[PDB]
Amino acid sequence: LVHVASVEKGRSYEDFQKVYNAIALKLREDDEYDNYIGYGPVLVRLAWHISGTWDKHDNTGGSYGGTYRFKKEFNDPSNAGLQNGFKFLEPIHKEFPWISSGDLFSLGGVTAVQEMQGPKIPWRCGRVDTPEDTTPDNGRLPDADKDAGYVRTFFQRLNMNDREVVALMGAHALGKTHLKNSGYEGPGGAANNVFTNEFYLNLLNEDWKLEKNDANNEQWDSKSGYMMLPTDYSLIQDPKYLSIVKEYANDQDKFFKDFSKAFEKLLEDGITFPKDAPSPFIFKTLEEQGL
Ligand code: HEM
Ligand SMILES: c1cc[n+]2cc[nH]c2c1
């Protein structure tokens, strides 16, 4: 399967910076969502789940085709709760009907991270919508109730290595688990709509307790009111993972730099970019624009 990036006709940096600003302006406006967390965390989760279907072996799945717009992927049990990120973006797609679905879902994730004061993420245009029959089947996204060997093995399919996996998981400092979506409940920290390295700090400094929640699932709970998933706590159980966790709890700039590279790579897996294709765009935030 080859998927070649095709820039939307005649579009350039300024067009996509207009779509960025539209998403970012609505993130500021619709602030009440999920008890004032706002839409940013569900939008970086949506960009991860449309990319996380990729399989390196046959180049199926991935962010290129925008296939989450089809019922099979929209109704995947693993995507429960992401309909709220879709409905947030649907106004903006009506306003810029020329951007492809893959591009709009991935730029929403980029915009949310930078607007929640994360690192800049280089983003590239050119994903092309593909037919309903290209939609990957349910079951390619990871279970939460498993251990470190499962996480390592699952992420080899998206060929991410240990460092990349640990840098990507730092995004679980954002938002929260919702019992009616996943059977898990609670936030992982106090700053859950500002991008920081707090996931790593909480993992190493809190007093975790294995408890059973109302959906009868086990999760790691702390006195402070935070929770960690079994696959999250996995990172301090494995010796290779645990020493990268310590590296990111001791250096927030290295965390930001490595997250930026692994999230771009995540979003680009499966796509062939021609050598005459434009460079990756670095978008300015509303704040850097005085907007
Ligand atoms: C083995 C890996 C992973 C598993 C099992 C997993 C699982 C989960 C689960 C069960 C939730 C709760 C969903 C809900 O109830 O609403 C969640 C939320 C979230 N995850 Fe993951 N995740 C994984 C990796 C990642 C990665 C790599 C990213 C992003 C780079 C990510 C970003 C998020 C975000 C931002 C949320 C919060 C959503 C919200 O607030 O609504 N996840 N994760
Ligand atoms: C997903 C979203 C939020 N949190 C908080 C701790 N772990 C996780 C996973």
Render the chain in DSSP notation, one character per residue.
---B--PPTT--HHHHHHHHHHHHHHHHHSTTHHHHT-SHHHHHHHHHHHHTT-BTTTTBSSSTT-GGGSHHHHT-GGGTTTHHHHHHHHHHHHHSTTS-HHHHHHHHHHHHHHHTT-----B--------GGGPPPS--SPPSS--HHHHHHHHHTTT--HHHHHHHHGGGGSS-B-HHHHS--B-SSS-TTS--SHHHHHHHHS-EEEEE-TTS-EEEEETTS-EE-HHHHHHHHSHHHHHHHHHHHS-HHHHHHHHHHHHHHHHHTT-B--TTSPPPB-PPPHHHHT-
The Cα 129–Cα 103 span in angstroms is 9
CATH 1.10.520.10 residue spans of the chain: 1-141+263-291
Q: Which class does domain 142-262 fall in?
A: mainly alpha
Ligand 1 pocket test target in 39, 49, 141, 177 with most atoms within 8 Å of CB: 177
Closest CA to 93 of 101, 102, 83, 85: 101
Q: Which class does domain 1-141+263-291 fall in?
A: mainly alpha
The encoded tokens of residue 174 equal: 């954002």
Residue 53 alpha carbon to ligand 1 centre in Å: 14
Q: Report which protein residue has its CA nearest ligand 2's atom 3.
A: 176
Residue 229 alpha carbon to ligand 2 centre in Å: 7
The encoded tokens of residue 179 equal: 């019992």
Q: Report which protein residue has its CA nearest ligand 1's atom 32.
A: 45
Entry resolution in angstroms?
2.1
Residue 133 CB partners (closer than 8 Å, separation 6+): none
Method: X-ray
CATH 1.10.420.10 residue spans of the chain: 142-262
The Cα 225–Cα 11 span in angstroms is 47
